[PDB]
Symmetry: T
Subunit: 160 residues, 12 copies
C-alpha cells in the first residue's frame, strides 16, 4: 500500500492576483457577449444574413467562454462577478453604438472589440500561466477561438 | 391576376414609439435576469447545490431565448432594441443581485423575487401591447408561463409544509 | 440602481379560487380522456385496427402532456391539482367508456364524442380563464387546437361520402 | 358517474361560412407565397446570392407549414379548403412574381412586398377570426410573428444606413 | 418438407385466472402512475427538484409497464380494464393525499405505494409463471424496475 | 504538367428544347404536389389515416423532385417557371376535385394524376437523355419514385 | 487468494441435442422472415398500407430473432444452418401462397405462420430451459414479441 | 390557357412477362446471397474473424435492401415477385454455401465468388431490362457497383502483396 | 368498491445474507473482468490488433454495465456491495491477467478463459439466487448470454478451420 | 437445379484503358479538392462568409467523389494514384493563384476549375459507359453534383 | 526535394521515467473510478439523487482520463498496468469506507480523493512537461476536469 | 466607474514571417499525410485488410481536420497558407508513398514512418512557435498526441509478442 493518510486533502486555491486576472477576462467576455447580441439584432445592409449568423456564433463562444472562466474561478476558490453594473464599470471594451449599423461598420466595430477582448487575455496570460498552467490552456482556447472569430468577421471588409 | 393587388411597395406593420418602449423594458429585465441567473449559478453553495446550480442554467436559457425573441420582435416591427450593459444596469427594475457566495436558501428567495419582478414588467405592459398587436401579446404569454413555472420550480425548494 | 426596485420580497401572481377550480375541471377530463384512450388503444379490433391503434396513442400522448401542463400551471399560480383516480372518476364529465372489445367503427364514435366533451369543458371555461390570466388562455388554445385536430383525424375514418 | 354526461353523441365546434372563408383567403396567399418563394429561390442571382437563396427556402418551409396548419384547422372545424393552383392564382391577393432571373436586390423588394401582403390578409381577417374562435387567432399570431421576422431577415439586406 | 398441414393454427390463450392476475397488476400499475403524477406536481420542500424528476421517471416506467401488461393480455386473448372507476375500486394501493406534501413525506408515501405495487406482482408471479414463463419475465422487469425506483427514492430519507 | 491554359472555361448549357422539356416536368411535379396536399386535407372514409399519411409522403417526394429539376435547369442555364398561373395553364394533369372525397375516390384520382405525371417524364426521357445522360438519371429517380407511390396508393382498391 | 489456478477454463458447452432444438427455432424464424416479405410485397386490397408496414415490422423482429438464436448457438459452440435448402426442407410452417393475396387472406395466413413459429419455440422450451435457463429467456422474448405481432395483425379481421 | 388532360383513368407502366422474369432472376439470387451471407456471418472462424463477421452483415444489409427494391420495383410495374424459400432454392444460380464452420480465408473466397455470381446475373439481365425500362436499369447499376464494392472489401483479405 | 390497503408503511423485499453474498461474488468478478479487459485493450499487440483493441472495449462496456446493475440490484434489496480495488483483488476468482504486452493470440486465449471464469461464477450462483428471487436471475441470464456472446466474438479469432 | 457448378467465379474486370479514364477523373477531383480548400482559406472580401462555406461544401462533394471513383477502380481491380506528385503532373485544371484573392475573383476562378473538372468527366463518359454503364451512373452523379456547385457559386457574380 | 530519404523514421520514444510518472497518474485515476462507483452505490441520505448522479459523472471523466493516459503511454511505447492488484498496492488515495455512508460524509470523502488524484498529477506535471509538453496538455485537462468535479461536489457541504 | 478603452481601431495579433513559415511547414506535411493516407486506404491489400482500410480513413480525417486548423490559424494571424498540390509536392518532407498495391504489413510500416515524419516536423517547429504564441502551440500539442495515437493504432499490427 502506498495510500496517503490525510483525511482532509485540500485543493489548489488561487492567490488574490490570479482571481483578479480571471475576473478581468470574465467581464470582457460578458461585455463581448452583450455587444455581440446587440450587433446581431441591429445590423443592416449588404450581406446582413452572413454577419447576423456569424455574430450569434461569436456570442455562443463568448458565453461558454465566460462560464468556463467563472466556474474555473470557483474551482480554485475565487468568486466571479458578472453583474451588469460591474461589467459596465470594469470592462475595457469600447462602448458599442445603440442604433442600426451598416454591415461594414459592424464588421469594424466588433472586430475591434474582439481584439480588445483578446488583448486582455494575452495581457494576463503569463501571470496565470506562471501560477497555474492548466488555466492557461483554457485561455489558449479563448485566444484561438476569439481570434478565429475576428478573422471570419473582418474578412468581409478586406482590400484584395 | 383578378384578386391580385397591383401595389409595388406594400410596407409592413410598424410599431409605435410606445409599443417599442414597452418591449424595451421587457428586454432589459430579461437580460438582467440572465446575468443574475449566471451569477447565482456560479456562486450558489450549500444544501442541494446541484439541483439549483442546474435549474438556474435552465432559467438563463429561457431568459436568453426570451430576450432574443423580444429584441427581434422589435426589429421586425421596425423598432431598435438596446441590450448593452450600461443600459440594462441603468434601466432594469430588478433589485441588484448581491455579491459573493450565497447559500442555496438565500439564492432561492433572491432569484424567486427577481423572476417575479421580471414577470411583473411583462404583466404591467401586457394590455398596452395586446391592444396594439395581439401577436406580440402571445410572445409575452409564453414568457409569463415559462417564467412562472421557473419561479415555482425554484421556490418549492424552500417551502416548509 | 436608478430604476431598480428596492423590494426584498415580490410575490408572483396568485390564481383565484375560481380560476383554480376551472383548471381542475380541465385537468380531470384530460386524464379521463387519457385513460379511455389507452383502454380504446388496447381493446379496439376490426377493420383498419392499426391506424386507430396508433392514432389513439398519439391522442393519449397529447392528453398526457396537456394534463401535465395544466396541473403545473396550477402549481405555478399557487393552486393545487387533483389527478387521483377516485377524483377523476367522480368529477369527470366524459361519458364512461364501455368495457370489452369494441370494433373500429364504434371506437371512432365513442372516442370522437369523448374528445369533444373534453374540448367542451375547455371552451366553457375559456372566457373566465382568459379574463383573469390571458397567458393560461393560450395554453387552452393549444389544447383546443390539438384536441380538435385529433377528433378530425379520428372521425374521418367513419365518414361516408 | 356522478358528473359524467349521458350524451351519446356530442358534436364539436363547427366553423361558420364566414370563418371558413376567412381562413381560405389566408390559405391561398400562404400558397402563392410558397410558390413565389421557390421561384425566387431558383432564379435569384447576383451579390450575396447564397444568403438569399437559403433564406428563401426557410421562408417557403414556414409558409408551407403555415398553409398545412390553416387548411387542417379548417378540416378540424368542418370546413373544406381549396389549395389548387387554379384557385390560388385566381383568388390570391399577392402581386404576381415576375419571370426570369432577378437580381438579389430586386428579389429582396419583390419578396418583402409579397410577404407583407400575405401578413396583410392575416391581419385584416384576425378580428373576425378571434371573436369567433380565439384558438385559431393564436395560429394566426404565430404566422404573423413568423412572417414578419422573415420579412425583416430579408429586407435588411437592402437597408442603406 | 417438414411443413405442417394446418391452415388455422391458433395462439396460446390464457385461462380466466391468468387474465385476472394480470388485470390485478394492471390496475395497480395505473394507480401508481396516477399517484406518481400527483406527487410529481404537489411535492415541496428540501430537494424538491430531485424528487420532482425521479417521480416522473417512475411514472414513465409505470406507464410503459401498464401498456406492456395490457397488450400482453390482448396477445393471450384477455381483455384489460384500466378505466378510472375500475382502478379506484380494485387497486390495492393506499390512497395518496390530495394536497402539498413535504419531500420527506412524499418519499415515504410513494415508497410505500411502489412496494404495494411490487407485492401484487410478487403475489401473482408463481401462478402466471406456472402457466406462461414468458409472461413471468415481463413481471421480472417490472419487479426489478419498480424496486430500483423504490431504492432511488427511499434513500433520500435514510439514517446513515 | 498537363494543366489547361483557359481562364474562362464555361459549363454545359442546354438547348431551348431541353429546357422546355424540363419545364414540362416541373409544372406537373408542382401540380401533383398541390393536388397531393389537397387530397391529404380533404380525404375521408375507410382507412383515412393510411392515405392521409401516404399522400404527404408523395408530396414530399414531388416537392424535392420539382426543386431538383428546377435547380438542374438553373445549372444548365435554363430558367424554370413554377408560378401558380403558369402551372394551372400548362400542366397536363386532370383537375382534382375541390371537396371532400372518399378514400376510394382519392386512391383512383391521385393514382391517375401520378401516372399522368410519370407519362410526361417518360415522354421527354429519350430527348433529355440524348442531350444529357446525367439529367436522365434524375428523371429515372422521379419515375421509380412516383411509380412506387402509385403502387403503394392504388393497392388500396385492388381486386384480389 | 480466491483466484483460480488453471489456464484454460472453459465455458458452458451446448449438447448436440440443445443445438438441435435451437436449430428448429432458427429455421422457422427464417422461413417466417421470408414469408413475411413475400406477403409484404404481394399483400393487396383494403387497408393495404397498415399491413404492408406491420409485415415489415414482423420481419425485422424475425430477422433479429434468427440472428439472436443463431449466435446463441455459436456462443455455446453449436453450428447453425440458415441456408435456403435446409430452411425449405425442415421448416414446420405451411407453405405461403404464390401470388397477390387480399389483406383479409394475408392477415389469416400470417397469423397462422406466426402461431406455428411460436409453437415450435413452445415445444422446445422445456428441453432448452432444463439445460440452459439463460437461453430460455431469449425464447421468452421471441414468444412475447411474436405473439404480440400475431395480435396486432389478427385484429384486422376480428369481428365483434 | 389549358394543357390539362381530360381522361378519367390514365394507366401506369406495365412490364412485359419477359421483363418481370428477369427481375425475378435478380431477386432470387439477391435473397440467396443474403441467406448465405448470414450463414457465413455466423460460422466464419479464424484469423481476422471480427472484420469478416462485421463486413458480412454489411453485405447482407445491402442485399436485403436490394432484394426489397427489386421486388417492389416488380410490384410497381404490375409484376409479381416470389421470394419464398422453396423457389429461391430451386431457381437461384448461386453455388450453394457449404454446411458448417468455415475458415476466414475460405469464407472470403466462397462469398466473393457468390457475389460475383449474383452481379453476373444482374449483368446478364441488364441490356434487356434497360431496353424496356432504363429507370429500372439505374437500380441495377446501384446493385452492381454496390455489390462489387462489397466483393472488393471482402476479397482483398486474401490478395497477396 | 374498495380493495385499497390501509397500512402506512408497506415493506420492500429484503435479500438474505446468503443472497447478498452471491451477488457480491458476481459483482467482484465482473469488475475484475473490466479491469483486465482494459489492460488487454491497451497492451494487446500483433496480427489483427485493431479488431481486438475494439472488441475488448465493447467487452468492458458490458461488464461495467453489468457490475453496475448487480451492485444496484443488491442496493435495491437492502444489500451492500463492495467494489473497492482491495476487495476485488482479494476475493476475485479470476486468474490474474499477465503484466505486460501480450500478442493478439495470447490475449484471445487469456481473456476468453477469464470471461468463462466470470460466467462460471454466475452459473454457480444461479440456482440459489433464482430460488430466492427469480427476477434477479433474469439479470443473471442477461450477463450470462451477454458475456458468452463476447467470449465467442473474441475466441473465434484463434479457432482453426 | 439452377445452381452454377464452378468454384471460382470471377467478377467483372476493368480494362487497363477503363482504369486510365477513371484515373483522369480522380486526379482532377483531387486537384479541385486541394484548390477548393486553398480558396476556402484565402478567399477574402465582400460576402466572404457565404463563399467560405460554399467552398467547403464543394470540397466535401469533391472528396467524396474521388473516394468513390478511386474505390470504383479498386472494385474492378484497377489501381488508383492520388499522390501529390501524380496529381500535380497530370491534373488538367489550371493552377490556382497563390495569395489572398477577392470573393469576385475566387468565384470566377473556382467556377472555371469546376467546369474543367466536369469537362474531363464528360470527355471520358462515352468510353466508360460503353464498357461499364454502372460506372457511368457514378459519373452522372458527379456531373450533376459538380455542375450544381458551379451554379451556386457562379451566381454571386451574375449581373442581370 | 524536401522529401526525407530514410525508410524507418521513428517517432518520439518515452523514457522509462516518463512512463513511470504517467503510471502514477493512471493508477490514481483508476482507484478514483472504483471509489466513485462505490460511493455512487452506497451514498445515502439527504440529497441522495444529486450526489448519486454527480458521482457517475465523476467516474465517467475518470474512466475517460485513465484510458487517455494509458493510451498516451502506449503511443510513446510505454506499457501501462491497470490491474486490480497494482492499483491497490500503488494508489496514493486513502482507502474508501466499506458500508453505506451519508451524503455529507460522501461529499467530504470524495472531495479528498479527487484532490489527492489531482495532487499526483500536479506533482508529476513538471517532470512530464519537460520531456513532452503535449502530454502536459492532457494532464492540464485532467486537472481542470477533476478540480471542477471537486467544486461541484464539495459545494454541497459549504456553509456561508 | 469606467475602464473602457477609447480607441476606434484596436489591432489583432500578427504572426512573424518566421512563425508563418513554420506553420506552413506543418500544413504541407499534414496535407501530404492525408493524400498518402487515402492512397494507402485504397491500395492496401492482404491479411487484416479491413481494419487497415478503416483506420487509415480515420487517420485522414484527423490530418484533414488538422491541416484546416493550421491553415486557418495562419489566416487568423494574418499569414497566408499554401496547400496547392504543386507546393505540397515540392516542399513536403515526408518520403513519398509507393505507387501501387501494397500489403497490409508494408502499409503499416510505410504509413507509420510517414506519421512519425509528420509529427517530427511539428516537434521541430514546436519551441519557436510556443515562444511567439503559446496558444498556437496547444494546437500543435493536439496534432502531436492525436497523430501519435494513430501511429500506435496502426503500427501495433506488426509488433511481435
Ligand atoms: Cl449561411
Ligand atoms: Cl438532476
Ligand atoms: Cl402508419
Ligand atoms: Cl471494425
Ligand atoms: Fe455553468
Ligand atoms: Fe437571434
Ligand atoms: Fe411535469
Ligand atoms: Fe398535413
Ligand atoms: Fe401500446
Ligand atoms: Fe432548392
Ligand atoms: Fe449477427
Ligand atoms: Fe419493403
Ligand atoms: Fe449506476
Ligand atoms: Fe473510402
Ligand atoms: Fe481506449
Ligand atoms: Fe475550414
Ligand atoms: Mg438535489
Ligand atoms: Mg390503415
Ligand atoms: Mg452572404
Ligand atoms: Mg481485423
Amino acid at each position: 500500500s502506498a495510500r496517503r493518510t490525510e483525511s482532509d486533502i485540500q485543493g489548489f486555491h488561487a492567490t488574490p492576483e490570479f482571481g483578479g486576472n480571471l475576473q478581468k477576462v470574465l467581464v470582457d467576455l460578458i461585455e463581448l457577449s452583450l455587444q455581440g447580441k446587440q450587433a446581431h439584432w441591429n445590423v443592416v445592409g449588404s450581406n446582413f444574413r452572413d454577419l447576423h449568423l456569424q455574430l450569434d456564433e461569436l456570442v455562443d463562444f463568448a458565453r461558454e467562454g465566460s462560464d468556463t472562466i467563472a466556474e474555473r474561478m470557483r474551482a480554485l476558490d475565487a468568486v466571479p462577478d458578472g453583474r451588469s453594473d460591474t461589467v459596465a464599470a470594469t470592462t475595457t471594451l469600447p462602448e458599442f453604438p445603440a442604433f442600426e449599423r451598416s454591415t461594414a461598420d459592424v464588421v469594424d466595430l466588433i472586430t475591434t472589440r474582439i481584439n480588445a477582448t483578446v488583448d486582455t487575455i494575452r495581457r494576463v496570460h503569463d501571470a496565470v500561466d506562471a501560477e497555474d498552467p492548466s488555466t492557461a490552456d483554457l485561455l489558449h482556447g479563448l485566444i484561438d477561438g476569439l481570434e478565429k472569430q475576428a478573422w471570419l468577421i473582418r474578412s468581409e471588409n478586406r482590400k484584395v
